[PDB]
């Protein structure tokens, strides 16, 4: 049910980490302060990789057209994005980050 991402220490606050999954679409893990979040890595407005975008607080900005989403709710924050991003469960147990292979 869960996948190993990395150690909480490996990610500095305000950074993003792409998680490639065998036989499945990639995910993106974001560290906002001391809390971690995860969504699909592919922007819903096209084919861009959000892990290659810019994180400002809890909002991720797509590198392609500047669209944006809230990494917590997956809801669009900036146009042209309109389709909600898939949000996946994340939990930090024993100084290690884990992401739910399935979306909430």
């Amino acid at each position: 049910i869960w996948l190993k991402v990395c150690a909480a220490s490996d990610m500095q606050p305000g950074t993003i980490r792409r998680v490639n999954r065998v036989g499945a679409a990639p995910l993106a893990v974001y560290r906002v302060g001391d809390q971690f979040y995860a969504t699909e890595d592919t922007c819903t407005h096209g084919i861009a990789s959000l892990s290659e975008g810019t994180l400002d607080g809890d909002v991720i900005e797509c590198p392609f057209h500047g669209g944006a989403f809230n990494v917590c709710t997956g809801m669009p924050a900036s146009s042209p994005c309109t389709v909600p991003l898939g949000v996946f469960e994340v939990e930090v147990k024993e100084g290690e980050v884990y992401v739910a292979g399935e979306k909430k």
């Binding site: 679409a25 592919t42 819903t44 909002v59 944006a68 924050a77 900036s78 146009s79 042209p80 389709v83």
Partner: protein
């Protein structure tokens, strides 16, 4: 938004109206007649700046924005309706459902993650009185009656009309139509003589300002409009003078018409009775783009049976359409076009020098500014823009 803020700041009584260069969003608009759209033959049109496609399936009308979500081309460039309920873009074959606009298939890549995850804009469409109305707005539409003048939808009311594209902003058309004193441009209309009409050259106002009109915001159906009451206390002018000498006379015919005139949002005029004592005229000035509008004319006449409808139909074709809709209203067309230059730079909205009868126009401007359901913007046309 659409106009220089320095200008809007100056117009304190109706800035929203001045800003509404592209028309009001979230209102129903007639764009064509039912007989012009046939089963399975998608038709194109531009409404409020937006390119749209209308199709008839199993007798029902559907409206999809005529712009593919992919590379933004018009699907109409080469229509490909491969199944009854869908339309396939000719470029990369993205396929959309007419009923909800959902991207249901992509022939060039049936495994695309975009399938089922994107939706092309659709607009509500309703046919009434043989007229096709499109709700150019968002969310569930309000009843059509809200955006139609009183009696247009009367069961016994037989509606016949004409539609064409005119080169002027919709507001110029509206104001010209509701303008009490513009009646002067109709003094030589063939309808005046040929239909023995009584028609003054203008009006000498009477009573106070508020008595010049009746602002309607208490309509049960929610209609918002204004009635021109200049004739209740005013003296009609039948002898025009210059330096005290009579230089022109109004028409002293026997038929009394147009004693009941009203304008309603989003921009439809009702003239009763006209062009004959037993008829009414309902005309819309629908925004196509900032420089053009559809001049959707319709004449209504109570009819109880097919015999009456056929008779009226014959009269419309042989008399009313050519003598009134054209013979009378044609002068309105070039009159509207004549105001384009003065308002084109938006400066006319500041420099215009109004006189008494324009009180009706002022009332309309204020009502429109206060009761419109939204201001259409170029961003609506290209794609809404908002930064977190």
């Amino acid at each position: 938004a659409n106009v220089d803020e320095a200008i809007l700041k100056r117009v304190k009584g109706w800035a929203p109206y001045v800003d509404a260069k592209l028309g009001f969003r979230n209102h129903w608009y007639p764009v064509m007649f039912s007989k012009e759209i046939n089963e399975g033959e998608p038709k194109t049109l531009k409404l409020l700046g937006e390119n749209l496609l209308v199709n008839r399936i199993d007798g029902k009308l559907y409206c999809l924005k005529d712009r593919c979500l992919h590379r933004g081309v018009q699907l109409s460039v080469k229509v490909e309706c491969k199944t009854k309920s869908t339309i396939t873009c000719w470029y990369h074959a993205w396929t959309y459902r007419w009923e909800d606009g959902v991207l249901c298939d992509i022939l060039t890549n049936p495994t695309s993650a975009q399938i089922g995850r994107q939706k092309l804009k659709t607009y509500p469409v309703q046919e009434a009185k043989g007229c096709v109305f499109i709700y150019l707005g968002d969310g569930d539409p309000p009843p059509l009656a809200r955006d139609t003048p009183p009696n247009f939808l009367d069961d016994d009311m037989e509606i016949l009309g004409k539609n064409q594209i005119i080169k002027s902003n919709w507001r110029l058309a509206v104001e010209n139509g509701f303008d009490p004193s513009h009646i002067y441009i109709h003094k030589d209309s063939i309808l005046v003589k040929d239909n023995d009409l009584a028609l003054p050259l203008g009006f000498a106002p009477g009573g106070d300002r508020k008595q010049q009109t009746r602002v309607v915001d208490d309509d049960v159906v929610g209609r918002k409009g204004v009635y021109d009451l200049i004739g209740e206390h005013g003296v009609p002018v039948f002898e025009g003078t210059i330096g005290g000498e009579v230089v022109r006379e109004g028409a002293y015919g026997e038929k009394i018409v147009a004693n009941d005139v009203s304008i309603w949002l989003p921009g439809v005029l009702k003239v009763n009775p006209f062009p004959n004592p037993d008829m009414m005229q309902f005309e819309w000035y629908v925004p196509i783009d900032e420089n053009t509008h559809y001049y959707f004319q319709t004449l209504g006449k109570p009819c109880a049976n097919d015999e009456e409808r056929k008779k009226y139909e014959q009269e419309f074709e042989s008399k009313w359409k050519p003598m009134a809709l054209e013979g009378f209203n044609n002068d309105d067309i070039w009159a509207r076009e004549a105001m384009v230059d003065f308002y084109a730079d938006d400066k006319g909205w500041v420099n215009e020098i109004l006189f008494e009868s324009d009180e009706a126009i002022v009332a309309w401007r204020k009502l429109a500014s206060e009761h419109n359901q939204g201001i259409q913007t170029q961003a609506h046309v290209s794609g809404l823009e908002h930064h977190h």
